[PDB]
Amino acid sequence: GPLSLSVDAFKIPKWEFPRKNLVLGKTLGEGEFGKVVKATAFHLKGRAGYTTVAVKMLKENASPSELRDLLSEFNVLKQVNHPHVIKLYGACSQDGPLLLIVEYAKYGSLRGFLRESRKVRALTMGDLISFAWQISQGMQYLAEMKLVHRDLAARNILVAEGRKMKISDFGLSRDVYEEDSYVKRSQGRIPVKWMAIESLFDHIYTTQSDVWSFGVLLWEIVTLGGNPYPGIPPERLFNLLKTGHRMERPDNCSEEMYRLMLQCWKQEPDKRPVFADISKDLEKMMVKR
Amino acid sequence: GPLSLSVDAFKIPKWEFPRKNLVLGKTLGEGEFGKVVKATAFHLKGRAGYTTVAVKMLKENASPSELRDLLSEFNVLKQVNHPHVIKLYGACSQDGPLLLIVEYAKYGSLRGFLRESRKVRALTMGDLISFAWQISQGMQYLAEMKLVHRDLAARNILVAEGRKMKISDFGLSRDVYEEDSYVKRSQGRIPVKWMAIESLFDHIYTTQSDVWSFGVLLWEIVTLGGNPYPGIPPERLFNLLKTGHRMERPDNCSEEMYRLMLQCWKQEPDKRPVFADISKDLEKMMVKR
Ligand SMILES: Nc1ncnc2c1ncn2[C@@H]1O[C@H](COP(=O)(O)O)[C@@H](O)[C@H]1O
Ligand SMILES: Nc1ncnc2c1ncn2[C@@H]1O[C@H](COP(=O)(O)O)[C@@H](O)[C@H]1O
């Protein structure tokens, strides 16, 4: 089937890194299909000595779906280059488990980062605006590359040296040059509280649904890593969304900032801003303190 | 789409149990889509007082796929009744998260049970034969009900009072009355080292692929919860299987018992035994000590 084809195609070099020059350490976390360890790499891509890196691999008892997801992420990270997208350095596919070697972000996920802090780490409203703007810059680049990310959420943004945002977790990202949408027949593996209404009901993914997710991500940033639709079971989402309900304005959120989330949540996909608009909105709030 | 339909259909009574008569306790474990807690239920289905039960629910940030899986398991457990299939008592769908209330197996999963023991808990070869035979009895009942389980593995068999086997985890089970196969277009969410060769390559599931999985389950029992194809990455499975390689005879395994696993692993699905044969084989080994 499609996977045995990919696996053989794959197994039969700008990117291959020798296993014996990689040393694995502590677990940094598990996503939906991969597990990430901290690692160090010897003589990696022209850098002398060791370089601290992160490594993605399959978990115990990986399913065909997870393997496909990992090969997919690999295939996306090859094409992609932007100071706010996590950077890929190589892979080991030749004599052990499949491993992806990516850029190490020292502060971990944005969720964890935000949950460890408070608002006056002490973060200003400016820092949060700055975080949202960086991610938005990255999204505009991907939307231009014609890639739908699909899984935009605070747990999937990493925080690197300098508090730089890195968009992460490309297992579920899809190419949309041809038709400007990705449509998936069976049920998506993306959490329901981050999905656009039309992805939920109709299985349609576009850059405009990434904007929806970004809106939820904004809610996460502004609340310092709160849980969306708190206390509401995911199954109530169908009806609550289609009857026009949205999350209430959170505390420590200006009128203009809440207007931007509501706008990312418009039922009609074409009424939502594009990432360039979102970027221009956050810049404007930044400069007005 | 198909899910919003199910969720509404569902939300709009032999099985409904009042939430306020259920009290939740410690986590017992997480599967691929659900999380299970220990629980106690007041006045459950004609039983006076409290009854210790297990409860399945959605994890944090459940995806449409996981929700569908949970509704599916619910829909299967309603139809099913056998002393070696986990028993369903009710659900709470009316004013909180969706919860399935099932029979509590006090020894947990068979994997954990077996890994905690040694071979002379001290378990005889007879006890292991007895375990395999019970599971096989349950599988014959399901195959007769025209249900493909799909996810047969030691982690998905529970051990109840009296060391009774209970087949568990019905999220992925499918009806096959009409056509005697379940075929899934996209990539399965079942671990690759338990899948039949034709499920791996061609996405075909039948009672005969359940037999394949059972063969792997037998390997797990006989090794006291060993890890299949140890040290071999799941992605090498395509080629290793299609070139006719299988797991070597493990230690503490008779010739006749190893013959039964190889037979469950025959490339051609029609050359594998049916569960009734498997049952008759294990009975025969039992009685010859
Ligand atoms: N490059 C990285 N550097 C540090 N931690 C990471 C990195 N990639 C992933 N992680 C951690 O592991 C988790 C799972 O990653 P993922 O499987 O890509 O969603 C993340 O939420 C982070 O906690
Ligand atoms: N009825 C039950 N009684 C005790 N433990 C259970 C029960 N159902 C599930 N578990 C535990 O939770 C794990 C996940 O269950 P599942 O999500 O059905 O695969 C199992 O592997 C067991 O460790």
Outline the structure in words.
Chains A, B: The record marks 8-9 as: Cleavage. Two copies of one chain form a homodimer. Chain A folds into two domains: 8-104, Phosphorylase Kinase, domain 1 (2-Layer Sandwich), CATH 3.30.200; 105-287, Transferase(Phosphotransferase), domain 1. Chain A has nine helices and 13 strands. In chain A, the strands form five sheets. A five-stranded antiparallel β-sheet of chain A has the order 1-2-3-5-4. A two-stranded parallel sheet of chain A has the order 6-7. Chain A has a two-stranded antiparallel sheet with strand order 8-11. Chain A is α+β, with helices and mostly antiparallel strands. The radius of gyration of chain A is 19 Å and the shape is globular. The longest helix of chain A has 20 residues, at 125-144. In chain A, strand 4 (88-92) and strand 5 (99-103) form a beta hairpin. Chain A binds chain B through residues 1-4, 7-8, 11, 32, 58, 60-68, 96-98, 185-195, 200-203, 227, 233-235, 238-239, and chain B through 1-4, 7-8, 11, 32, 58, 60-68, 96-98, 185-195, 200-203, 227, 233-235, 238-239. The complex binds adenosine monophosphate (2 copies).
